[PDB]
Design a binder for this molecule. Structure first.
Ligand SMILES: NS(=O)(=O)c1ccc(CCNC(=O)Nc2ccc(I)cc2)cc1
Ligand SMILES: [Zn+2]
Length: 258
């Protein structure tokens, strides 16, 4: 009876196995755009993805992860609110059953169709498993998806999903360039938070870009053909794999922009 996104094992149940679910810095949150304050001390974000080495795509039963070689400093995130160098390890998405829901963060209570998470770990902690035990261990770059024009740089991901339909399936996924998933502007909001899935560790500096990317209805329909189940189990479509907004508590969301 493992955690998931059903009526019986969904986000309102997670606190029984993971009591940090009711903690002081949980994610996601609603971004109240009027309450977020410009922080002129933040720096421009530095997204350095030219040497990124993708390896594999995995259906883990919760989402799909595009994994990177993080055994050297290739694809890194620096600057903004961050001290030091964070290495890209994987990206994944959260999405809805309908275009009106699917994001984890919200903006003035608006839900987007989906949300991309580019996950990075602080190199001063040596490995990803040590980094998740630290309050500044991870930096997750969050990007909203809205339905409209196709995102050409997403299509290579869309086209491999038939090969990882079910939980535990993986496929080789080399030479994928994550620069093709970024919007034009790197204007962002930032706040201290958590992983949005169990184990819900409070180890994330969240960096959420203001500018959504556009994907087509056909691209997101292909996400919704994935399965939560394993092969040879009853088909359960992988949709609504999002955690709703959590209390802000004693936190301030800072804006990089006026
Ligand atoms: N949605 S999100 O961006 O906030 C997000 C959710 C979850 C994760 C992965 C968490 N995995 C983990 O804690 N690692 C781990 C490693 C080694 C051992 I031994 C045990 C556990 C990444 C990003
Ligand atoms: Zn995520």
């Amino acid at each position: 009876h493992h955690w998931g996104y059903g009526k019986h094992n969904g986000p309102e149940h997670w606190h029984k196995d993971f009591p940090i679910a009711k903690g002081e810095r949980q994610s996601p949150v609603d971004i109240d755009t009027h309450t977020a304050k410009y922080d002129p001390s933040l720096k421009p974000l530095s997204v350095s993805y030219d040497q990124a080495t993708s390896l594999r795509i995995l259906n883990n039963g919760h989402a799909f992860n595009v994994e990177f070689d993080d055994s050297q400093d290739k694809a890194v995130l620096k600057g903004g609110p961050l001290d030091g160098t964070y290495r890209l390890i994987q990206f994944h998405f959260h999405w809805g059953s309908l275009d009106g829901q699917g994001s984890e963060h919200t903006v003035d209570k608006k839900k987007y169709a989906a949300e991309l998470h580019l996950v990075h770990w602080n190199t001063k902690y040596g490995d990803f498993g040590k980094a998740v035990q630290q309050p500044d261990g991870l930096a997750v770059l969050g990007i909203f998806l809205k339905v409209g024009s196709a995102k050409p740089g997403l299509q290579k991901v869309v086209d491999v999903l038939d090969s990882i339909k079910t939980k535990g399936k993986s496929a080789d996924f080399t030479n994928f360039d994550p620069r093709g998933l970024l919007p034009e502007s790197l204007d962002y909001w930032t706040y201290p938070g958590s992983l949005t899935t169990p184990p819900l560790l409070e180890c994330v500096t969240w960096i959420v870009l203001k500018e959504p990317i556009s994907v087509s209805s056909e691209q997101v329909l292909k996400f919704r053909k994935l399965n939560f189940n394993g092969e040879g189990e009853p088909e359960e479509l992988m949709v609504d794999n999002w955690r709703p907004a959590q209390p802000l508590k004693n936190r301030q969301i800072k804006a990089s922009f006026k």
